[PDB]
Design a binder for this molecule. Sequence first.
Ligand SMILES: NC(=O)c1ccc[n+]([C@@H]2O[C@H](COP(=O)([O-])OP(=O)(O)OC[C@H]3O[C@@H](n4cnc5c(N)ncnc54)[C@H](OP(=O)(O)O)[C@@H]3O)[C@@H](O)[C@H]2O)c1
Ligand SMILES: C/C(C=O)=C\CC/C(C)=C/C=O
Ligand SMILES: [Ca+2]
Ligand code: NA
Length: 364
Amino acid sequence: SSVALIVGVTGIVGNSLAEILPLADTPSGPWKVYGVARRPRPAWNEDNPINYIRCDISDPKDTQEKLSPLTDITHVFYVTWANRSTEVERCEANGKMLKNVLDVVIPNCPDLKHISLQTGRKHYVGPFELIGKIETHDPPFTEDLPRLKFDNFYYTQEDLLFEEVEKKEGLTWSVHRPGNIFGFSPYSMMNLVGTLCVYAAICKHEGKVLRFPGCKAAWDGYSDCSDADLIAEHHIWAAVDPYAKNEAFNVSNGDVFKWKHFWKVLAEQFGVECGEYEEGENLKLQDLMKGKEPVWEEIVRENGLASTNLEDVAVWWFSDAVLDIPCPLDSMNKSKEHGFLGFRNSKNSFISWIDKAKAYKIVP
Ligand SMILES: NC(=O)c1ccc[n+]([C@@H]2O[C@H](COP(=O)([O-])OP(=O)(O)OC[C@H]3O[C@@H](n4cnc5c(N)ncnc54)[C@H](OP(=O)(O)O)[C@@H]3O)[C@@H](O)[C@H]2O)c1
Ligand SMILES: C/C(C=O)=C\CC/C(C)=C/C=O
Ligand SMILES: [Ca+2]
Ligand code: NA
């Protein structure tokens, strides 16, 4: 029987894994599912038939307590991280988090088959504070080129993963590298779609034009993205397909787009006048949206929305870090050569995730 541990179940990918793993048509099903996060279970995560567990995986004592009784786990899906002010601090905090989970699950789960680790495109472009400032390999990024000669918590987690799986014979791993994720999660630390929806809603409320808060290269250069459900399918495929074992894979939608085109779609979905890129202007959402909490409360009250905190539902720093840089492309050749043919139309994915935020009454 298949039993999953989703580590970060209320996250942008964890929440897709919570909806997909229990479905009857899912490979290796029927799946029993345990979902871990620190907060109490939110209302928008309830619609999934998972066993929700409150646990802080940065706490070794808490991890030992909550996870040691889950002896029936066969597959681990690790979809979480902790942000710190520098990459060296991110290596320490994220290495400990992964090690705390693995040190407990491996000796306590005799039927444990696979550990799926989510990382990302920063494997190739570098940590947040070095992006655009270092020499990278040339795009499209392929999986097995050498690591950058700078600290990166993904390299720490991979090396920890490789040495952890040695403790159990027949234990396999996979690494999943998405770019910017289009998904649903009002609790995610990095939710571009959710943040853009809140921005569009505020513009509609204040009768302002939907100004583009990014650079020229993000506006009219090519971009790509990774649909959250597609990433969830990619985790599952690697977890059950023996030809996918012990490999790192990119996971992006299979097409490209331009923010210039998606700007129309976003404006049309919230009934706002479509603004554009302005050759001046250096617009930042972190600055534009400072002190909009009362305006968000007006929007919440007037449209019968779920009660959310502006700071949870709109991570302004992340939307600015995304739109103020070029989006170098990655390659899906390794995934496709291994039998994974999943893909998404990125524009349809974008509309689908906007509509999910609306359907859960997060935005108007
Ligand atoms: N989101 C993106 O656009 C994006 C793009 C590329 C790569 N990635 C990478 O994907 C990986 C996973 O991130 P994600 O974006 O999927 O995460 P996310 O959407 O921010 O979700 C994190 C999840 O883990 C939980 N969590 C956080 N800290 C925890 C802790 N100490 N103990 C237990 N649970 C904890 C969260 O709930 P609580 O806070 O309630 O605990 C939530 O359920 C990271 O390496 C990230 O860099 C993300
Ligand atoms: C390249 C791009 C947008 O244009 C967005 C990605 C920004 C990054 C790599 C943020 C960290 O996950
Ligand atoms: Ca990344
Ligand atoms: Na989709």
